[PDB]
Amino acid sequence: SELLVNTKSGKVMGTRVPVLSSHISAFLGIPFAEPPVGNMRFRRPEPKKPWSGVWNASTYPNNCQQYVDEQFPGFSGSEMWNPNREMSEDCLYLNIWVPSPRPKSTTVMVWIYGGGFYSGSSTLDVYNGKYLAYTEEVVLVSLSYRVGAFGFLALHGSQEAPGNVGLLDQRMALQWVHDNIQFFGGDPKTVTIFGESAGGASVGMHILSPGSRDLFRRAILQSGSPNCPWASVSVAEGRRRAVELGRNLNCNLNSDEELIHCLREKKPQELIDVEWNVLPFDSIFRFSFVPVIDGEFFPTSLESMLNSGNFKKTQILLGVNKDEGSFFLLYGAPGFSKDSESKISREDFMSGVKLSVPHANDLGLDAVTLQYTDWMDDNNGIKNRDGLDDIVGDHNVICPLMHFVNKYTKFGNGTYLYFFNHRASNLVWPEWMGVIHGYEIEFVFGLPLVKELNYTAEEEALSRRIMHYWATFAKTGNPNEPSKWPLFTTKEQKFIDLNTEPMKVHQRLRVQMCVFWNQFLPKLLNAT
């Protein structure tokens, strides 16, 4: 049977699903690790023990325990990101969509969800892999990994909560794909890992980590990169946050063992209830438990690894959206709200910059403020709002990505860069938010091909070329079919806009602002 597959872990039985008036097989909820519960909470993942009998992979698995967004109850704009299954610490599963008839040995794509390392689910409707698997004939995999304290509580030195375990969950699912995807018709020598936001940062982290490099072929990074300011912390900062988490739950803090034991007796929701209290600064776009530069998963600092070419050399395709920062301001900065145009006073602009570059002294805050203010029109509310939006996006996503791409390209085997600036016709978020962080995903997963979702015909056409670019790149290392997306090179630095207009090629994506964020401000904060 087409729905029965024999893996090295045991037999698994899928389910047939309809897609654009046709059908494909889906194997939902395949376990790849032992449930990280009880004493295994905070520990490195262990491989799933093989099972006898047939594993029912006909329904989505649980989502990992995470903070749930309740800012706009029932608003589809925000709820489409929340867990749509019951949450459970027993959440280490992967999902596979396989073309029908079963391919023999085709291109594989593995999706790694984002969510700032504190949330995310592989089961969301925008991540439904049937459209891409079907339209491009690829075997599409989506994995899961522990987030929040469960995935990233870090007490360096302890083997009980070493940190980075959520990245080790990702690695284990990739080990499983490498080892078993051939039975589903996937080619283990042609797997592309791709992800957005924290998922894109994760993809970049597996490209850097010696221990993950051999498990995949190529990579796609969407609005995220490994060196993002919110994507990692030192082992000392990770320790300080773990201790502060324990302090919030009245834990004995005399030894790592005492702290970890206490944290393990707490119900999941007790950890999530105080998670946000450990941030060191009043800040925006900062998450509590994220990867740690531990000397193992990351052998040295991310920057020296980038400088010395200490990373997987292959092809990469990556890019950013026009208004990466808007939703972080909506959710966390004074003066911004969902139902108003959010014109910002100079006072709110300034408290907004303080929130956006939490680690800066007064001189640094003045350098950012000057760089983003039009002094011939300083009380223009629209300009203040847009300037703040760009500050958040440039500092947190764009400039870190541009720095990663220029460092990568020097040693890599091929780079394709994009700038996604299409505002969807059916967007439910207000206009001031522009092309929002996460909104290129629906085009990557082909949602505009389904009539009921109400996209325009040109949006469907855009979705189809993006999917074909992503799959063609996954298959060959080049998004182009033998109008050209030019290669990004050290010298030329070309990239394309990705929207409904005829392709335009440009150069040096946000160079002006990124020289400020990647060279000047850091020098400024280091001297003062």
**Which residues of the shown chain bind ligand NAG in the complex (CB under 6 A)?**
56, 58-59, 74, 413-414
Q: How far is CA 271 from CA 64, 121, 261, in A?
A: 13, 18, 13
Closest contact distance (angstroms) between CB of 118 and ligand A1E is 7
Tell me whether residue 86 is one of the annotated catalytic residues: no
Nearer to ligand NAG, 56 or 528 (CB): 56
CB of 169 closer than 8 Å to CB of 192: no
Residue selected from 107, 170, 197, 493 as contacting ligand A1E according to rule CB under 6 A? 197
SS3 content of the chain, % helix, strand, coil (to 5): 40, 15, 45
CB of 45 closer than 8 Å to CB of 35: no
Q: How far is CA 298 from CA 170, 202, 306, 512, in A?
A: 15, 12, 11, 30
| Binding pattern for the stretch 16-55 against its own copies, x by CB under 8 A and - elsewhere | ------------------------------xx--------
Nearer to ligand A1E, 88 or 105 (CB): 105
Structure tokens at 102: 């079963």
End-to-end Cα, the chain, rounded Å: 68
CA distance 34 to 44: 10
Q: Does 134 help bind ligand A1E (rule: CB under 6 A)? A: no
| Binding pattern for the stretch 299-318 against its own copies, x by CB under 8 A and - elsewhere | x--------------x----
Site for ligand A1E in 67-86 (CB under 6 A): 69, 78, 81
Q: Does 179 help bind its own copies (rule: CB under 8 A)? A: yes
Structure tokens at 365: 């805050």
Tell me whether residue 437 is one of the annotated catalytic residues: yes
Please report the sign of the dihedral spanned by the C-alpha atoms of residue 255, residue 256, residue 259, residue 265: negative
**3-state secondary structure at position 475:** helix
Closest contact distance (angstroms) between CB of 409 and ligand NAG is 9
**3-state secondary structure at position 38:** helix
With contacts defined by CB under 6 A, name the span among 224-232, 326-334, 400-408, 513-521 that binds ligand A1E.
Answer: 326-334
Question: Quick one: what does residue 273 bind among its own copies, ligand A1E, ligand NAG, none, with the CB cut-off 5 to 8 Å set by partner type?
Answer: its own copies
Nearer to its own copies, 329 or 467 (CB): 329
Tell me whether residue 197 is one of the annotated catalytic residues: yes
Which residue in the list 197, 212, 225, 463 is annotated as catalytic?
197
Nearest to 234 by CA among 159, 306, 163: 163
Amino acid found at 58 = S
CA distance 20 to 135: 9
DSSP state of 501: S
Q: Which residue is nearest to ligand NAG (CB)?
A: 74
Nearest to 278 by CA among 233, 335, 309: 233
CA angle 517-439-202, nearest 5°? Answer: 60
Question: What pairing do the DSSP bridges indicate for beta strands 10-13 and 4-7?
Answer: antiparallel
Q: Does 79 help bind its own copies (rule: CB under 8 A)? A: no
With contacts defined by CB under 6 A, name the span among 323-331, 335-343, 351-359, 367-375 that binds ligand A1E.
Answer: 323-331
Which residues here bind its own copies, judged by CB under 8 A? Answer: 8, 46-47, 70-71, 73-74, 104-105, 175, 179, 182-183, 187, 189-190, 210-214, 217, 248-249, 270, 273-274, 276-277, 282, 299, 314, 330, 334-335, 337-340, 347, 351, 413
Which residues here bind ligand A1E, judged by CB under 6 A? Answer: 69, 78, 81, 114-116, 182, 188, 196-197, 276, 279, 327-328, 331-332, 436-438
Question: Which residue numbers are catalytic?
Answer: 197, 324, 437
